[PDB]
Every structure is written in C-alpha cells, then in structure tokens.
C-alpha cells in the first residue's frame, strides 16, 4: 500500500 | 507517521498556499511557470486515484483533497482568471520532453503492471522533474521575486524531508521503496543550485540569479 503523499 | 514526513507534508502545503495566496492577493501570476503548475496538478491527479480504493486516514484523505483543489485552483488563476499577466513568452519549456519519456518509464519500470500502479509511478517520476519549467523560466528572465524563492525553498525542502523520512521508515519499520527514493533524490538534486543561491544570496538580501 501507498500510505504517503 | 514520523516528524520528518509531517514537517515535509506541512512544508509542501506551505509552498502551495504561499503561491496561491501570492497570485490571488496581487491579482498577477508574473514570473510563475504555468507549465510547472500543470505538471504538479497532473502529479496529484495520477497519484491520488487511490482515494477511490483505499482509506489510510482522515489526514491522508484531507491532504490529498487539499493538494488537488489548490493545484487545480492555481492552474485556474494562471490560465483563466489572471491570464493577462501570464508570461507565456518566458514559460517556454517543452513539457513533451518530460511527459512522454516519464510516461514510457512508468510503463516499463514499476512495482506492478496494472493501471493504478503505472499511474502512481508516472506521478513519482513526473514530480522529480515537474519544477524544471519554473527553474528554466527564472534562468531565462534572470530574476526571481522573493515570494517566488520562498515558494521554491519550501517545495524543495519538502521532498528533502521525505528522504530523511525514508531513512527513518527503513531503520524503524523495515520499509523500502526504491522508486520513491531514487525519484526523490533526483527531485532534490535539481534544487542544489537554487538552495546554494537562496542561502548565500536571498537569505543575505541579495538577488537569486540562475
Ligand atoms: C543523519 C541521520 C538522519 C536521521 C536518522 C533517523 C534514524 C535514527 C536512528 C537512530 C538509532 C538509535 C535510536 C534507538 C533505536 C534503537 C533501539 C534499540 O536498540 O532497540 C533494540 C530492539 O529493537 C528493541 O528491543
Ligand atoms: C532504469 C532507469 C532508466 C534511466 C534512463 C532513462 C531516464 C529518462 C529520464 C529523463 C529524460 C529527460 C529528457 C530531457 C530532454 C531535454 C530536451 C532538451 O534539452 O532539448 C531539446 C531541444 O529542443 C533540442 O534542440
Ligand atoms: C534530470 C535528471 C537526470 C538524472 C536522471 C537519473 C535517472 C533516475 C530517474 C528515475 C528513476 C528510475 C527508476 C528507479 C529504479 C527502480 C528499479 C526497481 O528496482 O524497480 C523495482 C521493480 O521490481 C522493477 O520491475
Ligand atoms: C541509490 C541512489 C543514491 C543517491 C545518493 C544521492 C546522490 C546525490 C548526488 C549528487 C548531489 C549533487 C548534484 C549536482 C547537480 C545539481 C544540478 C542543479 O542543481 O541544477 C542544474 C539545473 O537543474 C539544470 O536545469
Ligand atoms: C543511510 C543514508 C544516510 C544519508 C543521510 C544524509 C544526511 C544529509 C543531510 C543534509 C544535507 C545537507 C548538505 C549540506 C548543504 C547545506 C545547505 C546548503 O545548500 O548549503 C550551501 C552553503 O552555502 C554551504 O556553505
Ligand atoms: C523533531 C526533530 C526533527 C525536526 C525535523 C524538521 C526540522 C527542520 C524543519 C524546518 C526548517 C525550517 C527552516 C526555516 C527557514 C525560513 C526562512 C524564511 O522564510 O525566511 C524569510 C526571510 O524573511 C528571508 O527573506
């Protein structure tokens, strides 16, 4: 998963 | 969440607000690359499509919506509302040399061959070079207004804080993403001459000359 901005 | 990423996200929001409020209050977008604002809006559009598939947190959702709204609003102010002050003659960077190869690279070098992942990879590669039209405009025109340099400082500091965040996450969580990291170092090294000139000249009351 991509949990950053 | 760690303090390096939080300061990095707040520095990114600071840059976005400084630019939006500068154009809004002065009713002018003189010295601003409309092309780099298009690229940053395209980065947020392709990166945050996961708003429809994933929920990380209220913070993560709200930040994404704020970045999309502020990036699209900045593009609206430059190309529609204050277009009389848009300096098209000096914003001459050919963005096709960024979009077409970065598009090609995102399809070939990614973590997974699926539309959402390819689009996310495109946003990562594109962001690393999205500021090029703005720096190229400043070097062509010769100068940069002080508010413009503050915008570039907080924007450049944001992805630099993300590099520190990735060292933190790698050591404490064992998390590592080489695509975000390599693109992040490319993104930060393109600010090296600006950082040196901002610290030695702008912070000493002198002209930022690229
Ligand atoms: C230039 C550097 C940029 C910033 C770098 C960010 C990372 C900082 C790391 C510090 C290591 C020491 C901090 C303490 C963590 C180690 C704790 C420990 O020894 O834990 C043993 C085990 O994991 C539990 O039992
Ligand atoms: C696995 C890793 C693969 C790494 C290898 C691929 C990386 C490609 C990245 C960026 C291309 C940037 C292109 C920049 C083009 C600049 C165009 C230019 O300077 O001039 C054009 C001018 O009009 C002439 O007259
Ligand atoms: C103006 C800038 C000039 C300098 C530009 C330097 C090029 C670096 C650019 C982008 C990163 C390229 C991709 C980074 C490597 C990722 C490879 C990888 O490990 O990908 C995982 C996957 O398994 C693979 O299928
Ligand atoms: C796994 C990868 C590890 C990577 C480890 C970090 C590597 C950083 C390297 C050099 C820093 C100096 C970069 C010097 C280039 C600066 C160019 C510049 O700032 O401006 C030119 C301008 O952008 C033209 O348009
Ligand atoms: C495991 C990986 C660990 C990697 C950890 C790397 C930490 C590097 C931190 C900051 C870079 C700052 C570099 C120094 C540049 C200072 C700012 C600047 O631009 O200074 C110019 C000034 O004029 C000079 O006199
Ligand atoms: C918790 C431990 C880790 C903390 C990690 C984050 C710490 C660094 C954060 C931000 C740097 C702030 C730099 C502020 C520089 C502001 C310069 C400025 O705006 O100067 C205006 C002046 O009038 C010139 O024209």
Author numbering:
A (entry chain B): 4 to 8
B (entry chain A): 1 to 210
Paper text:
In the archetypal KDEL-retrieval system, a seven-transmembrane receptor captures escaped ER luminal proteins carrying a C-terminal KDEL or variant tetrapeptide sequence in the mildly acidic pH of the Golgi. Signal binding to a luminal cavity in the receptor triggers a conformational change in its cytoplasmic face, exposing a lysine motif recognised by the COP I coat complex. Our previous work has shown the KDEL receptor has a transporter-like architecture and undergoes pH-dependent closure around cognate retrieval signals.
We then determined structures for chicken KDELR2 bound to HDEL and RDEL signals. These structures with TAEHDEL and TAERDEL peptides have resolutions of 2.24 and 2.31 Å, respectively. Both HDEL and RDEL peptides are bound in a vertical orientation with respect to the membrane, with the side chains clearly resolved in the electron density map. For the histidine side chain at the −4 position of HDEL, the imidazole group is predicted to form a π-π stacking interaction with W120. The higher affinity for HDEL is due to the stronger π-π interaction between the histidine of the −4 position of the retrieval signal and W120 in the receptor. To understand the consequences of these changes we examined their positions relative to the bound TAEHDEL signal. This reveals that E117 and S54 sit close to the −4 histidine and −5 glutamate, respectively and D50 is over 5 Å away from any residue in the signal in the final bound state. For the HDEL variant, protonation of both histidine 12 in the receptor and histidine at the −4 position of the retrieval signal favour binding to the receptor in the Golgi.
